[PDB]
Design an enzyme around this catalytic site. Structure first.
Site, mmCIF file in Angstrom:
data_model
loop_
_atom_site.group_PDB
_atom_site.id
_atom_site.type_symbol
_atom_site.label_atom_id
_atom_site.label_comp_id
_atom_site.label_asym_id
_atom_site.label_seq_id
_atom_site.Cartn_x
_atom_site.Cartn_y
_atom_site.Cartn_z
ATOM 1 N N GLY A 194 -0.529 8.381 -6.576
ATOM 2 C CA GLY A 194 0.796 7.993 -7.017
ATOM 3 C C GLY A 194 1.106 8.630 -8.408
ATOM 4 N N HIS B 201 -4.536 7.867 -18.386
ATOM 5 C CA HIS B 201 -5.633 7.418 -17.542
ATOM 6 C C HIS B 201 -6.907 8.153 -17.860
ATOM 7 C CE1 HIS B 201 -2.231 6.282 -14.712
ATOM 8 N NE2 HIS B 201 -2.579 5.324 -15.548
ATOM 9 N N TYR C 256 -3.838 12.395 -15.555
ATOM 10 C CA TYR C 256 -5.264 12.491 -15.251
ATOM 11 C C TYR C 256 -6.009 13.666 -15.902
ATOM 12 C CZ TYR C 256 -4.838 8.721 -11.768
ATOM 13 O OH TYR C 256 -4.650 7.468 -11.196
HETATM 14 C C1 LIG Z 1 -3.917 -1.238 -3.710
HETATM 15 C C2 LIG Z 1 -3.265 -0.004 -4.307
HETATM 16 C C3 LIG Z 1 -3.784 0.524 -5.456
HETATM 17 C C4 LIG Z 1 -3.327 1.723 -5.938
HETATM 18 N N1 LIG Z 1 -4.048 2.321 -6.961
HETATM 19 C C5 LIG Z 1 -3.691 3.589 -7.343
HETATM 20 C C6 LIG Z 1 -4.537 4.198 -8.391
HETATM 21 O O1 LIG Z 1 -5.628 3.832 -8.818
HETATM 22 N N2 LIG Z 1 -4.003 5.368 -8.947
HETATM 23 C C7 LIG Z 1 -2.933 6.099 -8.418
HETATM 24 O O2 LIG Z 1 -2.622 7.234 -8.797
HETATM 25 N N3 LIG Z 1 -2.247 5.439 -7.404
HETATM 26 C C8 LIG Z 1 -2.578 4.230 -6.759
HETATM 27 N N4 LIG Z 1 -1.896 3.658 -5.677
HETATM 28 C C9 LIG Z 1 -0.850 4.279 -5.077
HETATM 29 C C10 LIG Z 1 -1.127 5.621 -4.371
HETATM 30 O O3 LIG Z 1 -2.439 6.123 -4.176
HETATM 31 C C11 LIG Z 1 -0.255 6.003 -3.208
HETATM 32 O O4 LIG Z 1 0.713 5.081 -2.787
HETATM 33 C C12 LIG Z 1 -0.350 7.323 -2.489
HETATM 34 O O5 LIG Z 1 -1.677 7.822 -2.332
HETATM 35 C C13 LIG Z 1 0.483 7.277 -1.207
HETATM 36 O O6 LIG Z 1 0.012 8.053 -0.107
HETATM 37 P P1 LIG Z 1 0.390 7.558 1.387
HETATM 38 O O7 LIG Z 1 -0.262 8.488 2.335
HETATM 39 O O8 LIG Z 1 0.146 6.100 1.506
HETATM 40 O O9 LIG Z 1 1.933 7.839 1.322
HETATM 41 P P2 LIG Z 1 3.333 7.325 1.918
HETATM 42 O O10 LIG Z 1 3.802 6.067 1.312
HETATM 43 O O11 LIG Z 1 3.238 7.462 3.386
HETATM 44 O O12 LIG Z 1 4.339 8.475 1.298
HETATM 45 C C14 LIG Z 1 4.221 9.876 1.533
HETATM 46 C C15 LIG Z 1 5.568 10.523 1.787
HETATM 47 O O13 LIG Z 1 5.225 11.523 2.757
HETATM 48 C C16 LIG Z 1 6.180 11.519 3.820
HETATM 49 N N5 LIG Z 1 5.630 12.155 5.023
HETATM 50 C C17 LIG Z 1 4.737 11.683 5.905
HETATM 51 N N6 LIG Z 1 4.367 12.653 6.761
HETATM 52 C C18 LIG Z 1 5.076 13.702 6.400
HETATM 53 C C19 LIG Z 1 4.944 14.967 6.935
HETATM 54 N N7 LIG Z 1 4.463 15.132 8.163
HETATM 55 N N8 LIG Z 1 5.580 15.963 6.282
HETATM 56 C C20 LIG Z 1 6.340 15.732 5.203
HETATM 57 N N9 LIG Z 1 6.478 14.496 4.707
HETATM 58 C C21 LIG Z 1 5.844 13.449 5.291
HETATM 59 C C22 LIG Z 1 6.602 10.091 3.990
HETATM 60 O O14 LIG Z 1 7.989 9.956 4.361
HETATM 61 C C23 LIG Z 1 6.516 9.616 2.548
HETATM 62 O O15 LIG Z 1 7.824 9.674 2.002
HETATM 63 C C24 LIG Z 1 -2.260 2.371 -5.297
HETATM 64 C C25 LIG Z 1 -1.671 1.777 -4.186
HETATM 65 C C26 LIG Z 1 -2.188 0.607 -3.667
HETATM 66 C C27 LIG Z 1 -1.560 -0.007 -2.397
HETATM 67 N N1 LIG Z 2 11.522 6.497 -19.989
HETATM 68 C C1 LIG Z 2 10.287 5.894 -19.294
HETATM 69 C C2 LIG Z 2 9.977 6.430 -18.025
HETATM 70 S S1 LIG Z 2 10.939 7.760 -17.392
HETATM 71 O O1 LIG Z 2 10.450 7.878 -15.987
HETATM 72 O O2 LIG Z 2 12.336 7.395 -17.675
HETATM 73 O O3 LIG Z 2 10.489 9.011 -18.073
HETATM 74 C C3 LIG Z 2 8.779 6.150 -17.345
HETATM 75 C C4 LIG Z 2 7.909 5.199 -17.891
HETATM 76 N N2 LIG Z 2 6.753 4.769 -17.068
HETATM 77 C C5 LIG Z 2 6.618 4.906 -15.610
HETATM 78 C C6 LIG Z 2 5.404 5.464 -15.153
HETATM 79 C C7 LIG Z 2 5.216 5.702 -13.806
HETATM 80 C C8 LIG Z 2 6.239 5.433 -12.870
HETATM 81 N N3 LIG Z 2 6.189 5.675 -11.424
HETATM 82 C C9 LIG Z 2 4.906 5.740 -10.705
HETATM 83 N N4 LIG Z 2 3.691 5.720 -11.338
HETATM 84 C C10 LIG Z 2 2.494 5.758 -10.684
HETATM 85 CL CL1 LIG Z 2 0.901 5.562 -11.654
HETATM 86 N N5 LIG Z 2 2.611 5.838 -9.306
HETATM 87 C C11 LIG Z 2 3.822 5.855 -8.648
HETATM 88 N N6 LIG Z 2 3.928 5.872 -7.176
HETATM 89 C C12 LIG Z 2 5.178 5.932 -6.423
HETATM 90 C C13 LIG Z 2 6.329 6.690 -6.765
HETATM 91 C C14 LIG Z 2 7.449 6.740 -5.929
HETATM 92 C C15 LIG Z 2 7.466 6.044 -4.720
HETATM 93 C C16 LIG Z 2 6.351 5.297 -4.344
HETATM 94 C C17 LIG Z 2 5.181 5.227 -5.189
HETATM 95 S S2 LIG Z 2 3.738 4.247 -4.738
HETATM 96 O O4 LIG Z 2 3.761 3.016 -5.606
HETATM 97 O O5 LIG Z 2 3.827 3.734 -3.336
HETATM 98 O O6 LIG Z 2 2.566 5.182 -4.830
HETATM 99 N N7 LIG Z 2 4.964 5.803 -9.358
HETATM 100 C C18 LIG Z 2 7.463 4.893 -13.331
HETATM 101 S S3 LIG Z 2 8.763 4.639 -12.148
HETATM 102 O O7 LIG Z 2 9.935 4.219 -12.944
HETATM 103 O O8 LIG Z 2 8.879 5.883 -11.285
HETATM 104 O O9 LIG Z 2 8.236 3.447 -11.399
HETATM 105 C C19 LIG Z 2 7.665 4.596 -14.702
HETATM 106 C C20 LIG Z 2 8.211 4.575 -19.137
HETATM 107 C C21 LIG Z 2 9.314 5.039 -19.896
HETATM 108 C C22 LIG Z 2 9.464 4.479 -21.243
HETATM 109 O O10 LIG Z 2 10.446 4.878 -21.890
HETATM 110 C C23 LIG Z 2 8.598 3.459 -21.848
HETATM 111 C C24 LIG Z 2 8.812 2.908 -23.141
HETATM 112 C C25 LIG Z 2 7.871 1.998 -23.646
HETATM 113 C C26 LIG Z 2 6.723 1.633 -22.927
HETATM 114 C C27 LIG Z 2 6.501 2.173 -21.667
HETATM 115 C C28 LIG Z 2 7.442 3.091 -21.135
HETATM 116 C C29 LIG Z 2 7.343 3.604 -19.805
HETATM 117 O O11 LIG Z 2 6.310 3.296 -19.235
HETATM 118 C C1 LIG Z 3 -0.296 4.216 -9.202
HETATM 119 C C2 LIG Z 3 -1.426 3.538 -9.959
HETATM 120 C C3 LIG Z 3 -2.235 4.130 -10.941
HETATM 121 C C4 LIG Z 3 -2.182 5.575 -11.443
HETATM 122 C C5 LIG Z 3 -3.344 3.349 -11.419
HETATM 123 O O1 LIG Z 3 -4.001 3.905 -12.357
HETATM 124 C C6 LIG Z 3 -3.694 2.005 -10.974
HETATM 125 C C7 LIG Z 3 -4.995 1.434 -11.514
HETATM 126 C C8 LIG Z 3 -2.841 1.400 -10.060
HETATM 127 C C9 LIG Z 3 -2.993 0.062 -9.425
HETATM 128 C C10 LIG Z 3 -1.738 2.172 -9.576
HETATM 129 O O2 LIG Z 3 -0.955 1.602 -8.758
#
Ligand SMILES: Cc1cc2nc3c(=O)[nH]c(=O)nc-3n(C[C@@H](O)C(O)[C@@H](O)COP(=O)(O)OP(=O)(O)OC[C@H]3O[C@@H](n4cnc5c(N)ncnc54)[C@H](O)[C@@H]3O)c2cc1C
Ligand SMILES: Nc1c(S(=O)(=O)O)cc(Nc2ccc(Nc3nc(Cl)nc(Nc4ccccc4S(=O)(=O)O)n3)c(S(=O)(=O)O)c2)c2c1C(=O)c1ccccc1C2=O
Ligand SMILES: CC1=C(C)C(=O)C(C)=C(C)C1=O
Ligand SMILES: Cc1cc2nc3c(=O)[nH]c(=O)nc-3n(C[C@@H](O)C(O)[C@@H](O)COP(=O)(O)OP(=O)(O)OC[C@H]3O[C@@H](n4cnc5c(N)ncnc54)[C@H](O)[C@@H]3O)c2cc1C
Ligand SMILES: Nc1c(S(=O)(=O)O)cc(Nc2ccc(Nc3nc(Cl)nc(Nc4ccccc4S(=O)(=O)O)n3)c(S(=O)(=O)O)c2)c2c1C(=O)c1ccccc1C2=O
Ligand SMILES: CC1=C(C)C(=O)C(C)=C(C)C1=O
Lengths: 273, 273
Positions: B149, B161, B155
């Site tokens: 994510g 991180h 990283y």
């Molecule tokens: C318990 C938990 C803990 C987490 N901890 C961390 C952590 O330590 N650090 C960190 O960085 N993140 C963390 N995450 C979040 C993170 O690893 C992700 O959500 C990420 O790996 C998502 O991959 P996915 O395969 O689940 O994606 P999806 O949610 O499926 O998203 C992938 C995108 O790919 C698209 N897609 C699928 N197949 C295709 C295809 N065939 N071609 C083109 N597009 C396609 C889908 O529409 C989707 O929009 C955490 C999440 C959870 C639930």
């Molecule tokens: N302006 C921001 C922003 S910015 O995005 O506007 O640049 C960003 C920002 N942090 C900030 C950092 C990360 C993320 N998004 C983020 N991060 C991770 Cl580790 N994984 C994912 N995954 C993710 C992304 C999109 C869809 C699904 C997923 S998933 O959850 O299923 O993996 N998203 C996001 S989000 O808005 O996209 O959720 C905001 C901050 C700030 C601050 O200004 C700030 C001020 C004081 C203290 C802290 C902050 C701050 O943290």
């Molecule tokens: C997206 C994401 C990052 C990068 C993390 O480091 C941890 C610990 C969680 C849960 C997480 O959700």
């Protein structure tokens, strides 16, 4: 055969992703044994402006100087400028030609537009009696490689900008198929200022992977010139029999030849009829 | 020989990018001539919890049940649970093994952590007198393929991180190299929820390109076991000669073997020393 490539680039900055796409392509094709030549237009100071100065010696008529007449003559007689000749020679030796450019105002940059206007000379590149699949470049293959500021959904049937296949038709039919080229699918890189650094590296690996088999790809569909009556009595219109058989079809033959019906999907973006 | 591959997936949703990465790898490897076997852990209802119920019949000592002792006996005698044996057969026939998973809390998902705990048995996968390069999987290669994510810059050495090479060390050394595998470079896909849909297709194309020559890559570096004094009188510590030579080096031997000095540089992400 399958062995010489010309790559034409239109970008000034060497830090550009467009420069980087150019470099990936020289590398993939040199690894399969191709000879590669470049026309990097800004590093060459290429003059983009058509004028009576592209000719040497005597104009057949300076009173009413007309560029198509004058430059095919000068081409028959060896009177064209030296920068135009050096490009005509590259083109003539290439089996494949790639054009690499950013999308500017829904077309090609002014410097690539000027290269088409000065190098593709009447008698060298076309004749008004051998247009389209009868053109001089019938044994060559070509493709456009384009980067964009806007996303892929903005250029779909329902997005704000409208359909990409309509933006590409003036170039792929009107310039390239006109001179007889076999036109291949474009390489389209959308949203480039918004894609993360590590994904951009993968966009380049993906391009090199395609170029390992480009010469055996199928080309895009264009309606053949035998479907038309080519003379001024008939008006260069589709033959009566073809007009009759087409009545049954739900789809037009292509983007420019939609015939008031539905355009067949991605005619200008994916190969096969 | 070099011809059989096993892919272990850890994601419940078939709409995931992780499932899409697994499907491009079956495809790429099958066009090259490989025999591909899969362990889709969530579609198999795989039980992740270790317990005395993994053994059939006789506990040598139910009063003081000790899992490593009991499962190596059960392995020699053919008394292990049938979901563990079926997994052990795939592994024993595979030359290449690929683990595909999302990063969850800076580690592997609980279902994959539970497949290492239950399938890599004392006596089958390791012995305490044949650890690391003397292990039974000497002849095989493996690689982690991870989605994240957070972005690539979060990283790096200077990101919130901290360094990704430190997160990967407990898995790649502690589990994979401990049992004798040659470990290949990880496939790392950062920021997958923020990358445009068009670029995501090219991420999949770059992964299938890598897989065409995978068996020819060099492994990551780990310090060999011959540098150490392996018995309880010495303490399993680096040899005194090795300690002396190392005094002149600026860098550590690797991430876990940093020795108070500088960690060599992408030790766990790029091959060779
Ligand atoms: C318990 C938990 C803990 C987490 N901890 C961390 C952590 O330590 N650090 C960190 O960085 N993140 C963390 N995450 C979040 C993170 O690893 C992700 O959500 C990420 O790996 C998502 O991959 P996915 O395969 O689940 O994606 P999806 O949610 O499926 O998203 C992938 C995108 O790919 C698209 N897609 C699928 N197949 C295709 C295809 N065939 N071609 C083109 N597009 C396609 C889908 O529409 C989707 O929009 C955490 C999440 C959870 C639930
Ligand atoms: N302006 C921001 C922003 S910015 O995005 O506007 O640049 C960003 C920002 N942090 C900030 C950092 C990360 C993320 N998004 C983020 N991060 C991770 Cl580790 N994984 C994912 N995954 C993710 C992304 C999109 C869809 C699904 C997923 S998933 O959850 O299923 O993996 N998203 C996001 S989000 O808005 O996209 O959720 C905001 C901050 C700030 C601050 O200004 C700030 C001020 C004081 C203290 C802290 C902050 C701050 O943290
Ligand atoms: C997206 C994401 C990052 C990068 C993390 O480091 C941890 C610990 C969680 C849960 C997480 O959700
Ligand atoms: C005259 C004008 C009109 C325009 N009209 C349109 C229009 O009609 N429609 C539309 O969608 N857009 C339009 N644009 C914008 C658009 O086409 C772009 O700016 C876009 O093509 C950027 O590509 P570039 O090669 O210039 O990339 P850059 O601006 O250089 O950015 C690309 C990113 O890639 C990075 N990069 C470079 N090399 C590497 C490498 N080797 N590996 C990884 N990363 C690297 C760069 O650091 C940069 O971050 C217009 C722009 C102008 C100036
Ligand atoms: N909420 C938005 C937003 S959103 O970004 O928040 O989703 C976005 C948004 N428009 C909006 C649409 C596109 C772009 N970005 C955009 N577009 C193009 Cl065609 N090219 C590029 N290129 C680009 C991107 C990044 C870096 C460099 C470059 S480059 O110019 O040099 O190529 N960026 C940008 S920008 O913020 O990134 O500048 C805003 C709008 C809206 C509106 O809500 C809205 C409401 C009423 C009327 C209009 C709008 C509106 O237009
Ligand atoms: C000038 C201009 C036009 C016409 C566009 O349509 C888009 C998409 C961009 C980025 C742009 O910069």
């Amino acid at each position: 055969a399958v062995r010489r490539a010309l790559i034409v680039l239109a970008h000034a900055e060497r830090t550009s992703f467009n420069y980087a796409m150019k470099e990936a392509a020289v590398e993939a094709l040199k690894k399969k044994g191709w000879e590669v030549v470049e026309s990097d237009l800004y590093a060459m100071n290429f003059n983009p402006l058509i004028s009576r100065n592209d000719i040497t010696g005597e104009p057949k008529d300076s009173e009413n100087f007309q560029y198509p007449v004058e430059s095919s003559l000068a081409y028959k007689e060896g009177r064209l400028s030296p920068d135009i000749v050096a490009e005509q020679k590259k083109l003539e030796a290439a089996d494949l030609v790639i054009f690499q450019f950013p999308l500017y105002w829904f077309g090609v940059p002014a410097i690539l537009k000027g290269w088409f206007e000065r190098v593709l000379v009447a008698g060298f590149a076309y004749t008004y009696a051998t247009m389209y699949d009868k053109g001089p470049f019938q044994n060559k293959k070509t493709l456009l490689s384009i980067t964009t500021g806007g996303s892929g959904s903005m250029y779909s049937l329902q997005g704000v900008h409208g359909d990409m296949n309509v933006i590409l038709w003036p170039i792929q039919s009107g310039i390239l198929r006109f001179c007889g080229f076999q036109v291949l699918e474009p390489q389209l890189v959308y949203s480039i200022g918004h894609t993360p650094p590590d994904a951009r590296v993968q966009v380049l690996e993906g391009w090199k992977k395609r170029l390992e088999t480009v010469w055996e790809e199928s080309p895009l569909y264009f309606a053949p010139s035998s479907l038309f009556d080519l003379n001024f009595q008939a008006g260069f219109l589709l033959k009566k029999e073809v007009q009759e058989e087409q009545k049954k079809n739900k789809f037009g033959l292509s983007v420019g030849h939609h015939l008031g019906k539905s355009i067949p999907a991605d005619n200008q973006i994916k190969a096969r009829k």
